Design a protein around this ligand. Structure first.
Ligand SMILES: C[C@@H]1CC[C@@]2(OC1)O[C@H]1[C@@H](O)[C@H]3[C@@H]4CC[C@H]5C[C@@H](O[C@@H]6O[C@H](CO)[C@H](O[C@@H]7O[C@H](CO)[C@@H](O)[C@H](O[C@@H]8OC[C@@H](O)[C@H](O)[C@H]8O)[C@H]7O[C@@H]7O[C@H](CO)[C@H](O)[C@H](O[C@@H]8O[C@H](CO)[C@@H](O)[C@H](O)[C@H]8O)[C@H]7O)[C@H](O)[C@H]6O)[C@H](O)C[C@]5(C)[C@H]4CC[C@]3(C)[C@H]1[C@@H]2C
Ligand SMILES: C[C@@H]1CC[C@@]2(OC1)O[C@H]1[C@@H](O)[C@H]3[C@@H]4CC[C@H]5C[C@@H](O[C@@H]6O[C@H](CO)[C@H](O[C@@H]7O[C@H](CO)[C@@H](O)[C@H](O[C@@H]8OC[C@@H](O)[C@H](O)[C@H]8O)[C@H]7O[C@@H]7O[C@H](CO)[C@H](O)[C@H](O[C@@H]8O[C@H](CO)[C@@H](O)[C@H](O)[C@H]8O)[C@H]7O)[C@H](O)[C@H]6O)[C@H](O)C[C@]5(C)[C@H]4CC[C@]3(C)[C@H]1[C@@H]2C
Ligand SMILES: C[C@@H]1CC[C@@]2(OC1)O[C@H]1[C@@H](O)[C@H]3[C@@H]4CC[C@H]5C[C@@H](O[C@@H]6O[C@H](CO)[C@H](O[C@@H]7O[C@H](CO)[C@@H](O)[C@H](O[C@@H]8OC[C@@H](O)[C@H](O)[C@H]8O)[C@H]7O[C@@H]7O[C@H](CO)[C@H](O)[C@H](O[C@@H]8O[C@H](CO)[C@@H](O)[C@H](O)[C@H]8O)[C@H]7O)[C@H](O)[C@H]6O)[C@H](O)C[C@]5(C)[C@H]4CC[C@]3(C)[C@H]1[C@@H]2C
Ligand SMILES: C[C@@H]1CC[C@@]2(OC1)O[C@H]1[C@@H](O)[C@H]3[C@@H]4CC[C@H]5C[C@@H](O[C@@H]6O[C@H](CO)[C@H](O[C@@H]7O[C@H](CO)[C@@H](O)[C@H](O[C@@H]8OC[C@@H](O)[C@H](O)[C@H]8O)[C@H]7O[C@@H]7O[C@H](CO)[C@H](O)[C@H](O[C@@H]8O[C@H](CO)[C@@H](O)[C@H](O)[C@H]8O)[C@H]7O)[C@H](O)[C@H]6O)[C@H](O)C[C@]5(C)[C@H]4CC[C@]3(C)[C@H]1[C@@H]2C
Ligand SMILES: *[C@@H]1O[C@H](CO)[C@@H](O[C@@H]2O[C@H](CO)[C@@H](O)[C@H](O)[C@H]2NC(C)=O)[C@H](O)[C@H]1NC(C)=O
Lengths: 483, 197
């Protein structure tokens, strides 16, 4: 009833082989075009000016860091990180008690830091080791004396602190830096804070946070520091505000299972083709079927996206599963049927003899698959009402295509064979396009002297992630010297 | 005696082989669900991979060996060995599906129980409709899945799992399908591996 159709189809293919090759290859390129390359202004780093304003994007809290340095004469006695560090903090505690109790005509009359300071006591479980190091009353200010719970008497009354501050340095080179370097700020290795005689530059890093900035406060504060600091520096700059971008790191283990899949997939291939290494012909023969089904799914992706109906999915994590489901027996069931045919001339007749006979079964298998997938789409679950469409398109494409490209490859192949090279070259090119869309599996793989991190760590400690948000820093200096 | 000893070789050889396999799987598959453990002293890489302890993977693979040495010998002793699709490729298809489903184990959220029945019945049934039409392996995988379900559901009553919430239905609805699939996969593995010689 119908084998006449596929019969004439073999008459048509070998008659007009190469134009069909062109149609299919160029539609392949039309679909594999966008994927491997393809009301907010710029979420990424966009620094404008300190005298300016933000992008007005919340969740984005900006912290201000203060740098201060102490010097003793190139000649002195009893140079230990205890005494040379204490008097710095002798002044630090006074400064802390000034700022925390900063009385001044701010926007709210006699206002202090607390009125706008990030007030929150969200102490998370793992804070056990430091149940006495971070403020929990209602203030967000970090200093090394925080360890001493804002007690300078204990500080300048204790017997020793170097070991005590060491008390929480676990090991070396850990992505989670510390708490010590934090309330020091100055990295003892980059800042160069080491117990060196006649060459010592101890420094203390201070931190603060807020929601809205009001320089009416901070400029006037700095009026106090011009007298308090009184050091010899020209640093002043002007107005430049920096907005660090919060990048989120996908670990490695999070990545493993995906790759496992691809491994499995390659095995599905080598094993298919060992069925074909039997018959007298070259390896590239197998190649023809490999590139095709794949090129179809790839092709399918292109027509599945641009219509606008894959708003929640990628291919690198699904694409294999199709190559798993629909499979390749749907092209070798007929291949063996072809080579099994008599050795006659005008292959146009041999293929129209065998392919014509297997047409019935191929259509039955197709209708089976479509019954399956139509059942799925009939379900109201949305994520499956997505994947089913990837499927149906890949399937109809594999079918409406294979009879065109692979069929013609076989034609020219047995032509050159029983007789004795755009074919193999176009095949290699299709395989290059395939390996390219494969290397394009990344679609699912998706001041500054400070460390790479420890900025989000703070917020990580309070059921708050700053990866989406941005942070900004501005700086001031206050240094000292004596013998 | 060297001949029957070479037989015993082949036998427990294949068992160790697929034991390593069951392990590889359980590792990868535990690692699939991505927990957000913010805690201080973040996890070292290998600890993120080699999770739990020596308790899990040896048992998982022991189960695999049990299965792979069970399904072929039963049909060796009862009837005739299997021949439906028995070439590695279909085995790999089954494995990939077993992986995909478990990857669908967490990243869905259902409307109603009827949707889960209507779909999982068909899914499990198909995974036997396609790679093994033996009624034996069917009635055996169903059984061992039943029993894995029960053992789990009563051990955590002492406590290994350590979860307790309205989600008590996940186990009563989802996992037995997993273990069903696993028995069948491992069976096709054992067949394709034993009928080498
Ligand atoms: C023959 C072979 C042998 C080997 C093998 O094959 C066959 O056997 C198989 C079998 O054996 C498999 C195991 C079976 C059991 C499986 C259990 C599974 O964990 C479960 O994962 C489920 C995923 O749906 C549930 O988790 C919920 O999943 C929902 C869907 O996304 C979430 O939405 C919800 O989060 C909650 O949603 C509601 C909100 O209101 C809550 O705020 C929020 O939390 C989660 O539920 C909870 O979500 C949390 C955040 O994600 C935690 O995950 C928590 O877990 C608890 O988190 C606490 C945090 O401190 C922790 O202290 C405690 O210990 C944890 O339990 C979890 O409940 C469930 O609940 C959780 O259990 C795990 O992924 C894989 C698992 C192990 C499997 C690993 C692989 C295996 C071995 C297989 C293996 C190959
Ligand atoms: C007939 C047979 C049947 C069997 C089969 O053959 C034929 O059929 C096929 C079919 O069955 C297949 C499966 C179908 C379902 C598929 C689902 C798919 O999961 C998708 O994966 C995406 C990856 O980006 C998204 O998931 C995100 O993944 C991110 C990276 O890990 C997470 O980071 C994020 O979660 C976020 O983590 C951080 C938290 O702070 C956030 O709170 C949380 O969101 C996730 O995104 C979340 O993913 C959720 C998935 O449920 C929701 O989408 C959710 O959004 C909200 O979710 C709410 C609860 O659901 C909902 O109410 C609300 O409206 C939504 O807005 C979304 O944030 C997306 O999301 C999720 O779907 C998965 O990759 C493959 C999948 C398993 C398929 C595998 C292979 C199959 C088995 C095939 C199989 C061969
Ligand atoms: C080889 C493979 C292996 C796997 C497999 O194939 C072969 O094996 C198969 C087999 O193994 C299957 C399982 C068999 C056992 C099944 C049990 C079944 O639970 C029952 O499901 C029923 C519907 O089919 C009812 O569930 C109701 O579902 C409604 C939604 O559609 C809810 O709406 C209602 O809750 C009520 O809705 C109305 C509100 O006003 C109420 O506030 C609220 O409670 C639910 O019913 C309630 O569901 C709750 C949570 O699920 C409690 O269970 C509760 O318990 C009640 O507690 C009362 C306390 O006083 C008591 O009096 C009363 O009697 C109890 O019912 C029960 O009412 C019923 O209710 C509930 O139980 C579950 O859906 C699916 C189930 C797991 C099946 C999952 C799929 C399987 C694995 C199959 C699977 C493919
Ligand atoms: C017919 C046969 C029958 C038998 C069999 O074949 C077929 O059937 C199969 C089937 O049945 C399988 C089982 C099914 C049920 C499965 C349950 C599963 O439990 C889940 O395992 C997950 C793996 O990630 C999660 O476990 C957490 O994983 C996190 C990392 O992702 C950890 O972070 C956390 O540990 C926490 O780390 C941080 C610390 O600060 C916490 O203190 C600590 O808890 C873990 O959760 C922990 O898991 C531990 C064991 O793995 C403990 O349970 C512990 O709780 C208690 O912790 C105490 C600490 O002092 C300790 O003293 C006590 O002993 C513990 O009980 C629990 O927090 C999750 O959360 C937990 O649900 C378990 O992994 C494997 C499991 C069993 C399977 C093993 C293999 C099987 C059996 C197969 C078996 C072959
Ligand atoms: C801390 O995490 C908890 C638990 O996820 C969040 O509190 C809940 O908010 C979510 C929805 O946003 C719900 O799943 C829970 O019902 C809430 N439970 C509560 C309020 O306990 C909470 O948002 C997080 N806290 C912060 C500061 O963001």
């Amino acid at each position: 009833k119908i084998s006449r159709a596929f019969y004439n189809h073999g008459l048509l293919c070998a008659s007009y082989p190469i134009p069909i090759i062109l149609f299919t290859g160029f539609c392949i390129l039309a679909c594999c075009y966008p994927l491997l390359k393809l009301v907010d202004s710029d979420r990424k780093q966009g620094e404008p000016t300190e005298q300016p304003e933000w992008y007005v994007g919340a969740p984005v809290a900006y912290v201000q860091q203060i740098f201060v340095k102490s010097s003793v004469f190139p000649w002195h006695k009893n140079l230990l990180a205890v005494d040379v560090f204490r008097s710095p903090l002798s002044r630090a505690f006074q400064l802390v008690e000034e700022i925390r109790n900063h009385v001044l005509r701010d926007s709210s009359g006699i206002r202090s830091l607390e009125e706008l300071c990030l007030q929150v006591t969200d102490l998370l479980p793992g804070l056990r080791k430091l149940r006495n190091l971070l403020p929990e009353h209602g203030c967000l200010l970090l200093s090394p004396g925080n360890f001493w719970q804002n007690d300078w008497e204990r500080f300048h009354a204790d017997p020793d602190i170097i070991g005590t501050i060491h008390q929480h340095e676990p090991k070396t080179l850990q992505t989670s830096a510390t708490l010590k370097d934090l309330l020091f700020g100055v990295p003892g290795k980059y800042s160069g804070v080491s117990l060196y005689t006649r060459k010592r530059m101890v420094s203390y890093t201070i931190t603060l946070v807020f929601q809205h900035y009001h320089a009416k406060f901070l400029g006037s504060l700095r009026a106090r520091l011009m007298l308090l600091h009184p050091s010899p520096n020209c640093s002043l700059r002007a107005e430049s505000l920096v907005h660090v971008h919060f990048k989120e790191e996908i670990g490695v283990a999070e990545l493993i299972p995906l790759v496992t899949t691809y491994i499995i997939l390659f095995a599905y291939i080598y094993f298919s083709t060992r069925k074909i290494d039997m018959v007298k012909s070259k390896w590239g023969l197998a190649l023809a079927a490999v590139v095709t089904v794949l090129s179809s799914l790839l092709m399918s992706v292109g027509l599945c996206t641009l219509f606008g109906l894959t708003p929640t999915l990628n291919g690198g994590e699904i694409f294999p599963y199709l190559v798993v489901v629909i499979g390749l027996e749907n092209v070798l069931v007929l291949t063996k049927s072809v080579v099994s045919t008599p050795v006659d001339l005008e292959v146009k007749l041999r293929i129209a003899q065998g392919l014509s006979s297997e047409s019935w079964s191929i259509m039955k298998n197709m209708a089976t698959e479509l019954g399956i997938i139509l059942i799925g789409y009939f379900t109201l679950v949305p994520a499956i009402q997505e994947f089913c469409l990837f499927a149906v398109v890949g399937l109809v494409s594999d079918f409406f295509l294979q009879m065109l490209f692979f069929t013609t490859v076989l034609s020219i192949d047995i032509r050159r064979m029983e007789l004795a090279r755009l074919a193999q070259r176009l095949i290699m090119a299709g395989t290059v396009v395939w390996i390219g869309i494969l290397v394009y599996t990344d679609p699912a793989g998706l001041w500054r002297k400070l460390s790479f991190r420890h900025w989000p760590t703070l917020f990580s400690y309070y059921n708050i992630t700053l990866a989406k948000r941005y942070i900004s820093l501005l700086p001031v200096i206050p240094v000292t010297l004596r013998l | 005696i060297s001949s029957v000893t070479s037989q015993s070789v082949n036998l427990m050889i294949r068992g160790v082989v697929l034991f390593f396999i069951g392990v590889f799987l359980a590792l990868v598959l535990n690692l699939l669900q991505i927990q957000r453990n913010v805690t201080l002293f973040p996890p070292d890489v290998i600890a993120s991979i080699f999770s739990s302890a020596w308790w899990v993977p040896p048992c998982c693979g022991t189960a695999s060996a049990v299965i792979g040495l069970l399904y072929p010998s039963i049909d060796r002793h009862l009837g005739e060995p299997h021949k439906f699709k028995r070439e590695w490729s279909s085995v790999m298809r089954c494995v990939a599906v077993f992986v995909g489903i478990n990857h669908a184990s967490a990243k869905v959220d259902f409307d109603n129980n009827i949707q889960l029945s209507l779909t999982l019945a068909a899914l499990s049934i198909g995974l036997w409709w396609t790679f093994d039409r033996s009624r034996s392996g069917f009635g055996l995988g169903v059984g061992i899945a039943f029993l894995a379900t029960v053992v789990t559901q009563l051990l955590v009553y002492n406590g290994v799992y350590q979860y307790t919430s309205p989600d008590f239905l996940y186990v009563r609805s989802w996992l037995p399908c997993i273990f069903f699939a696993g028995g069948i996969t491992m069976g096709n593995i054992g067949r394709q591996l034993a009928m080498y010689e």
